[PDB]
Amino acid sequence: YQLEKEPIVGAETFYVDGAANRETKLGKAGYVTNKGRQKVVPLTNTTNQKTELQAIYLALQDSGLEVNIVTDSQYALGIIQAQPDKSESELVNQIIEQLIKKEKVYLAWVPGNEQVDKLVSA
Amino acid sequence: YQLEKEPIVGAETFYVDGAANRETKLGKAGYVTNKGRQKVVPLTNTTNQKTELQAIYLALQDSGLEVNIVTDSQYALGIIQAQPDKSESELVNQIIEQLIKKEKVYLAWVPGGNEQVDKLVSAGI
């Protein structure tokens, strides 16, 4: 897989996000696209970091051969930009699988996303 | 397929809904379930009825061998209660395939969570 170097114009954009409870250990992973498409999946005994991976997997599954995805997660960006072969992470190997089956994917990090944010922090 | 007659204990209840712009033929379909799972899909060239039948389908697809669905569509209630074999609509045929796959499914009609879901399908129509 290759990552695009600039946005795909016309492709649907997913503002993926994810949150978890330190104490309850529960979370939400979801998204929101510029087409008004949406999704929230409550998670059990997870971590922020995994919710954010969860986020990015959701959007990879729901999307279309050419996609643009927007996280605020540095942790997920690094993994993906490294382009692993395989990982000991199951969730990761999954994403990895999803990226290989796409024609064009563009991912971007960012500090809209507040939309998905209110959403995930239930 | 056979419809249960009471809400199934232990199964997640899906509050399904759909809505379309009568002029633009723009619509949304989706659900909100008691476990906080949600979904909204943007639809093209559709009616209030196709939107509603789509909401059900989505629910059927995202749930598991046992499901409680609660709709406000009498339209969808009656096709589904009829226990059709086959129908002239693709959509419907897909719904059926799902119903058949399910272990247990209770479908109810209402005219709470159903409001959360309204607002969501309703935003942009």
Swiss-Prot record, chain A:
Positions bearing the site annotation: Cleavage: F14, Y15
Domain (RNase H type-1) ranges: 8-122
Mutation effect (F14A): Virions contain primarily p51 RT
Outcome, altering Y75 to A/G/H/L/S/Q: Complete loss of RNAase H activity
Reported impact of V16K: Almost complete loss of virion production
Bilayer-spanning residue ranges: none
Amino acids binding Mg(2+) 2: D17, E52, D72, D117
Result after altering Y75W: Almost no effect on RNAase H activity and replication. 6-fold resistance to inhibition by BBNH
Protein known as: p15
Top-level taxonomy: Viruses, Riboviria, Pararnavirae, Artverviricota, Revtraviricetes
Shown chain mapped onto the complete sequence: 1026 to 1153 of 1447
